[PDB]
Design a protein around this ligand. Structure first.
Ligand SMILES: [Mg+2]
Ligand SMILES: [Mg+2]
Ligand SMILES: [Mg+2]
Ligand SMILES: [Mg+2]
Lengths: 314, 314, 314, 314
């Protein structure tokens, strides 16, 4: 066995010692890890709804952290104001179990969260949760796959942690990851080819028949956001979830879905945009607001952006 | 805890009692399950090559089963003749760790196997492994995902088993599964759109702009065969791995990749073909021979087949 | 000869003048009658496939009616969208030649159709054909027997028309028919006695050994749906096509087989159910969907229903 | 002046060309518009009863349309059977001049109508007017305010038309309107606070002191149904007319008041319910039957519904 275990806690603990945290973020992240480990377990045996189980699990651990004041979940109509006695300084937006639809086919589902520091001195309210993604102080997700992973983006980089099931701790596996500058994979559901705007139809076209005669990009789309975004972070490329008829503003939620993934992308060196603007700069008006997202290696989203404006004729 | 555990072993044991097996198949399948459980473990922590580890693991457990005589692996140039003392009546073709390429992105990789009964009275040789897929007596795969699954197709149906990590046994989860008649998902790497033959280009086209004005099929492609084939078995639809420039005969291997998946499809009520002929009817000439594969719900591969012949102009 | 001929056309023409039709239904029904008359002829001499001939015949006459937009046939994998120029407001579901299997033994085969008014303002699609039977505006069948009959159920009753071969017109023969309240004949293939659920086994039993010591019902089963359903409408009784092993959801199709016959039954004063629910209330998900059917005189299907629930133990 | 005028007639004329109408609906709607324009005029100068004038006006224009057979007015004890010579296929329910009580204070009063297609082949009778709101083929109202508006809900959406007094035509102003998902205004006469059931008292309470500390909803109640419902459709929010002591079943009439407004709400993307059930699903027993109504943005009536059942303890 190893005598010096590099656990996530040790890591967030060092990090917090720089800025001089009170340690709340550590309580927050520890509580979160407990919820994630419980979910990985439910998932690894749920066969021999989980959605509500996961929501409650994450909600309860978060509250017991004494580190939060406002909880916004994909699973809740309204924002949650944490009791005064368990109150703390952070606002956390989360999607307890994402990809919960195609869950049977074992397609890598996951948990997504974004953490903001409350700014107003007054009583907590939904307003605290309506901050632009650029205001996030931490963000990440857990991918429940062959192994349970937790990717975390602090204000100093992206680090990948893998759950060691023998001791139930997330061990640092990759430190300060950077997304490659240009990738060879594009990802999106081409089954909606019929509703795609001309910009996307053109961009895709340039992928299958490159004009400089290079090898065309390969296609890859899992169907679960956390899965597609993770492959993107890891091997590079681009991920697209534009608007169509069935979802004229995109299908992915802004607060607890696009923002946390946008923040991780930038910290990783990638980019995240709506075509018009960067996801992190969008100021939210509603906690369940959606947004179109194009994200990935910088050289590919930029190439996308040119084609976007060539058609914006602004 | 449950007092009556429905383990895979109990199941293959009942099944074997019908035909009146000597019990070799049970030894074979038990040895296999041990190898799979060891691999799920290596995988769940391989981060904090596996290919060769897995090959050796599966090879060794198979030999110790006293149930086999000829082993054909994706990882081996030639077929393996099992020692006389450990010799048994079955020939097993396998792919120890498939999807071993995009393994980092947690995209559901797996193990694939096909089991044949030796027919010739003479000394074992490669010839024993060169039988048409229709001659298989058992087949299945293990999907290493959120949970480790083992799908098995005996001569009586397809059953899904999920690994209970607490006791290390595969518990029967789904009995005699049937693939839906028609699905709404199509799966293939459209990044090779440029090399696709007219039949596929047309079929795909009919998917994105249905002529009867129905809703178009959704796209889904994980990149790992076992993953894509499993989602197909589960939610229905179609999976396509045709030939192109880089692979003019298809990329998937016949013996230990297409055949086992073709056999499971048929037993599930689906179909598996090359366009010209059914995968199970192809008589192999080489153990590493490849084949183009179209497989899935019957109503979709048939629809594909019409378009195939409309272009075959035979 | 008669100076005042009571033809079907005159009849649908009067009827249409009530509701104030544009006359499309008349064009539709006239085109249909032409197809039926051509088929009766092919049949009356087919000896000295017809299926495909009949499908094309009915398809072509329907399109030329300028009264339809979506055609669903038993003979077609998908629904048919009628050309814009020949487009009209109705959706018609049909089974061109039913009983086409035991056709040699002269056992009364026939054509079945159901007519729906399109509801959506948008482009025609399969969805227009997926309406519950209770939405039918007209329905009927043609029985090709000793005489060619056409039974039609408008929203005002059931009328029987017989083809006068001398002038090639269907003359009204029976106006507003009503099925008797209770009949003395039961109809179903008892050769599947082995797969029958306990409810049916009990019901049949009460038929051969009536508990009130009355005379037992006679048995009658032609093998051709249109034939059995017609004898039922005429002399009363009950017709049963439940589910078994070979057909766990029933063998008869919902859209163009059970629905049109269910609608006629109700309009005739009879009932049509699956055991659980009335056939007309089932909302279709697929154009080739099947359904178990019990239909006939009200006093008999009700008696059946009691025994059904006595075993449902819901 | 504009060379291409987008009049309501042109619009209902295009729409009718889809379904293939005989043109009756156009005659119907044109006759209606004439009655509305005459009323807007009487109203714009009635100062320098109107109720009976309006009833007669609408009754006469409707009859001259040759498009109706049964007329049900708020102003008439019984239903009206239209003469055979002027008879047509539609049944129209209407409230000629609503809000006719607080008319002096200039509070936006209006005309409300609902149109049904007759179904029975027999002689017209009151029964034709007793169909559930979900059976409506068209519905709308005219708001006589700063401008005269006509809101129409066809089976394809809601469109707002404004009367151009210079040429006396209703010009399309807003196409296919959608009610916002959640609004910030609640509307009801709180002066009956004393008779309100606990569900409403609680819901209102959650509006003035939001539990998630958000800004409380503003109050707005004009006193005239058409006015309150129109502001609701336009800016979103919720409208409530529950039952009390003075009106234990609600005050608004079902046929020509709640149904037409319920149909418009749904077509607009909103909802309309009694607390127990949706207004459109209520099958009428009497032409002057009343119903409690809660209607508006979906996110608000749903929030209401939860509180309704939390108190139904069903
Ligand atoms: Mg989600
Ligand atoms: Mg392989
Ligand atoms: Mg048939
Ligand atoms: Mg009124």
């Amino acid at each position: 066995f190893d005598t010096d275990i590099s656990t996530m806690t040790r890591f967030v603990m060092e990090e917090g010692r720089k800025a001089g945290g009170t340690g709340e973020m550590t309580q927050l992240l520890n509580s979160l890890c407990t919820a994630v480990k419980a979910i990985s377990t439910a998932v690894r045996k749920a066969g021999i709804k989980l959605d509500v189980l996961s929501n409650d699990l994450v909600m309860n651990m978060l509250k017991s952290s004494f580190a939060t004041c406002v909880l916004v979940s994909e699973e809740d109509k309204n924002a949650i104001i944490v009791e005064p006695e368990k109150r703390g300084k952070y606002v956390v937006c989360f999607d307890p179990l994402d990809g919960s639809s195609n869950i049977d086919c074992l397609v890598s589902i996951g948990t997504i969260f974004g953490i903001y520091r409350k700014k107003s001195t007054d009583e907590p309210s939904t307003k605290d949760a309506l901050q632009p993604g650029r205001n996030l102080v931490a963000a990440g997700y857990a991918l429940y796959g062959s192994a349970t992973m937790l990717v975390l983006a602090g204000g100093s980089g992206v680090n990948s942690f893998m759950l060691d099931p023998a001791i139930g701790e997330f061990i640092l596996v990759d430190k300060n990851v950077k997304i490659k500058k240009k990738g060879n994979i594009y990802s999106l559901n081409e089954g909606y080819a019929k509703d795609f705007d001309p910009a996307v139809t053109e961009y895709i076209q340039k992928k299958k028949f490159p004009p400089d005669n290079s090898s065309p990009y390969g296609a890859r789309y899992v169907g679960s956001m956390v899965a597609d975004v993770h492959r993107t972070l890891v091997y590079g490329g681009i991920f697209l979830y534009p608007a169509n008829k069935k979802s004229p503003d995109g299908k992915l939620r802004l607060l607890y879905e696009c923002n946390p993934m946008a923040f991780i992308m930038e910290k990783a060196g990638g980019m995240a945009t709506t075509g018009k603007e960067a996801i992190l700069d969008i100021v939210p008006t509603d906690i369940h607001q959606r947004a179109p997202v194009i994200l990935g290696s910088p050289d590919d989203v930029q190439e996308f952006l040119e084609i976007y404006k060539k058609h914006a004729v602004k």
